[PDB]
Amino acid sequence: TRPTDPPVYPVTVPFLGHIVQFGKNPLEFMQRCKRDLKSGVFTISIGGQRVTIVGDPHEHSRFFSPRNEILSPREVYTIMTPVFGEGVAYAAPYPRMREQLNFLAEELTIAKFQNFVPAIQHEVRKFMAENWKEDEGVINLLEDCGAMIINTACQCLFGEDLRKRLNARHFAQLLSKMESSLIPAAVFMPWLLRLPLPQSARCREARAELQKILGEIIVAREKENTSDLLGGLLKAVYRDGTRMSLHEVCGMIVAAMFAGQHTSTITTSWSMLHLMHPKNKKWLDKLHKEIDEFPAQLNYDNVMDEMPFAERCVRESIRRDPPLLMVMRMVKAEVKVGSYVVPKGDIIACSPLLSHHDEEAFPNPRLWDPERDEKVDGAFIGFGAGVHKCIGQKFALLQVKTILATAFREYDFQLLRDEVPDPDYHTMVVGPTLNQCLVKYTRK
Amino acid sequence: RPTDPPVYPVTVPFLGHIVQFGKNPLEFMQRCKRDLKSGVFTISIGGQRVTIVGDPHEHSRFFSPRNEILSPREVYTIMTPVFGEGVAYAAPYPRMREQLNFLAEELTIAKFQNFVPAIQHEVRKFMAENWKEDEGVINLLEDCGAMIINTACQCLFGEDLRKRLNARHFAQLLSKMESSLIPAAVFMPWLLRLPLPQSARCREARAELQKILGEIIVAREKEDLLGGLLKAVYRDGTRMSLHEVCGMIVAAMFAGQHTSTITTSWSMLHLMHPKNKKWLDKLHKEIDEFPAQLNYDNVMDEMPFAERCVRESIRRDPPLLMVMRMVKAEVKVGSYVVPKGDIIACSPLLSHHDEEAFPNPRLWDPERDEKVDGAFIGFGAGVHKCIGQKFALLQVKTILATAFREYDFQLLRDEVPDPDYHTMVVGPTLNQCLVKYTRKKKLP
Ligand code: HEM
Ligand code: HEM
Ligand SMILES: OC(Cn1cncn1)(Cn1cncn1)c1ccc(F)cc1F
Ligand SMILES: OC(Cn1cncn1)(Cn1cncn1)c1ccc(F)cc1F
């Protein structure tokens, strides 16, 4: 304790200290901390590592503004090394990391988008046509949104040859094996990673199978690409004279697909679940009124400039239940957050989960109300902000919006459950409880 | 202190020797046996003393003592989310025994009568559907996996359970439970008090199975393994709960799935390697005696050579590396006494490589025999000896008889695969298992 420290939540069980409670309900646990300590800015213990939460939305900037030398991502992203590739992205020196991210940025922006809406529509219609064939049936909506999200992304981002060698299902399995390997505990207790774990070898094996497949597509392709993701990075030349290695190319592909697969899936699922719930009739009607204006074949302009209501729907689903609960950095140099200074060596967090539930910024936050707006500027941080803000944001909104436009024009849905699913907090990227996602479709 | 196995010296207290042991348990335990000039020694895994009874003349003093002296419960804690909380090792010891015995009395032995032809059918159906070409490239470890689930399901389940729970779906649930486990935790039990998404994947998989099994039982109550345990009445008046029935089904299939798969794969890999021509000929000479339809007697009393082949595969590379107990009361092992609170281990991997018991142990030689009585402990011994042993050998022998009568195989690699030690249950490195099949016959 220095006298310029956020209040600390009292710890019992030193070795843990709060990992079980936080682990069990992050929302409920961080709101008890904010309330009992009368402070938005506080410090918990996770396995003995101090974690300072910047849970006051008026203070959001002081987390998202500072450069890499003050608030550092590398150390928190160490867990992802076996996914992105060993010296890749956050694990490269910071200027090279930025080029790598920017090369990905410039493949989702924005002459590239031109063929995206119709490629998303085609995959959605093919999926509904093959899986929702009956007049009426029961589906698990989280599993099917998953299938659609991989199918649509693949079709937007890959040539037919890569898709003929790596089908969407096969891809989802590889991505899924990588994700289910990770142990979020270790972000806070990095010694856990010096332990032999079969999980990390499952995750390297998965990554290595992808690079192998990708390498075969590249040799094949170099015997007589244009718009597609792979062919872009193939042609990326760094500041210096040099080109990307296979390992890095695989890196940025993994990173883009890994990023969007679970988060957009969850978001599409949440959005539909709200929309189909009886109380939410008012909003389902508003959506049909936006979307029934449009033709069978949609375009860039339809989805982008002319669906502000669908967007509000997607944006509020992520507001109520952000899939990424916590944004984190390692405090390399002490920092003023409000009053208080966060000491060197702390993990500093800014939590979309917690900030999207501040009663000042989001009055009555458990209410899903798509016509609402943040009452504190910057409060919404679902896709981050500052130097690390999400670069799939635009792709993600357009994909989810396009699916909603296509699914609801064609089907009605009934939630088979009285209430909207609980969020299930046992997993790294957080979604609605899988158990509770049975829905009944009626073909219109 | 004076009556303690020599301790391998520890640097890095926190880990002990988890990394070395983690990376190559054979080489690491043989360096310990050689430099300390003692079969019986004590290593450190994350700070827990582990005493290895690595002298085969001393095997009995590990396997003989009853549950009050050498206790399994504490080492089986990791499997709680698989078998079911409170189930098997987690029940009091007498009830544990009834539960195991009920499982035992479902693989012994009027039950076996229909097993050989059900294994053959599934094997021929699999080859017919997957090895259809004149010749092709398969991954042998994956396909032995598919055969092992298909054959066991067809031996153990009624049509109705197989209709509702297909073999592939079963394999996924099993595989999801198994890839959750963190063997480190057997030695550092505090790791389990950590919220991990791994355990929740494992519980969810378990709970999907019970739910399906519960639907089969209600369906079935409106006029094989499942129906046995349904019929089981304990010593007292009472019957098994759904939770325990699920437990014993999960335990028997979890048990056989990865170990038999690994054994079938090893067996074939050796037999197909050019240097093992001598043995591949002997096998053909045993099996070419028999008709197209085999029976119990064919596989059981009349294939001593195939068995030697299976047994030597497990001898060179046992899938379960370490048999373990918690020392509740101090025990004499050779000279030395193993203190209360030590984990006492007996390692098939290490004892199957003692020069005395198994001269030149990295040689696969199916005609060899242990030169130290009891040395082979691939299926354990004493009160906890494997109860799928008989079923395992019959399954593998029946597959080998069926595969090799119909196909030849070429290892696509100069040498037999390395064992891959990154995984809980150990097999041949998946990478190195590409094999080329040549079909010897036609129809379908
Ligand atoms: C609703 C879906 C998504 C959500 C909620 C989301 C959320 C976020 C958040 C909160 C961050 C900040 C990470 C940090 O500050 O450490 C982020 C970063 C990132 N996202 Fe997403 N994201 C989504 C979709 C996508 C998609 C589809 C892509 C595919 C390109 C993507 C690629 C990335 C990348 C590369 C970063 C790091 C970029 C950088 O470090 O500058 N995301 N995302
Ligand atoms: C090649 C295949 C197999 C190998 C190498 C193997 C190995 C072993 C070993 C070493 C043990 C000793 C456990 C201990 O002392 O902790 C064991 C126990 C056991 N096995 Fe297997 N096993 C195999 C196949 C199977 C199969 C197919 C089943 C299916 C029912 C099965 C069911 C069991 C059960 C229930 C136990 C515990 C019984 C008790 O504690 O009394 N095993 N096995
Ligand atoms: O944030 C992730 C990594 N992550 C955090 N929790 C679990 N995985 C996911 N993500 C970000 N946007 C969408 N998904 C990510 C994946 C890729 C990446 F380049 C950065 C990055 F933070
Ligand atoms: O030993 C297993 C479970 N296990 C041990 N290490 C990793 N998983 C495997 N096993 C035993 N025979 C075949 N496989 C087991 C599974 C079921 C069981 F009842 C006991 C038991 F030890």
Numbering used by the authors:
A (entry chain A): 27 to 250, 257 to 476
B (entry chain B): 28 to 250, 260 to 480
Article, verbatim:
Both T. cruzi and Leishmania parasites have an essential requirement for ergosterol, and are thus vulnerable to inhibitors of sterol 14α-demethylase (CYP51), which catalyzes the conversion of lanosterol to ergosterol.
The two CYP51Tc–fluconazole structures reported here superimpose with r.m.s.d of 0.68 Å, revealing some conformational differences in the F-helix and the BC-loop, which may account for the distinct fluconazole binding modes and result in re-packing of protein molecules in the crystal lattice. As expected, fluconazole is bound in the active site by coordination to the heme iron via the aromatic nitrogen atom of a triazole ring and by multiple van der Waals and aromatic stacking interactions. The 2,4-difluorophenyl moiety is enclosed in the pocket formed by the heme macrocycle, the aromatic side chains of Y103, F110, Y116 (BC-loop) and F290 (I-helix), and aliphatic side chains M106, A287 and A291. Although fluconazole occupies the same pocket in both CYP51Tc structures, it adopts two conformations that differ by the 180° flipping of the 2,4-difluorophenyl moiety. A 2.6 Å H-bonding contact between the 2-fluoro substituent and the hydroxyl group of Y103 may help to stabilize orientation 2, which appears to be less sterically favorable than orientation. In orientation 1, the H-bond between the 2-fluoro substituent and Y103 is broken due to the 3.5 Å reorientation of Y103 toward M360 resulting in the 2.7 Å H-bond to its amide nitrogen and in the flipping of the 2,4-difluorophenyl ring into a sterically more favorable orientation with the fluorinated edge facing away from the heme macrocycle. Perhaps both ring conformations co-exist in the CYP51Tc-fluconazole complex, possibly correlated with the conformation of the BC-loop which affects H-bonding pattern of Y103.
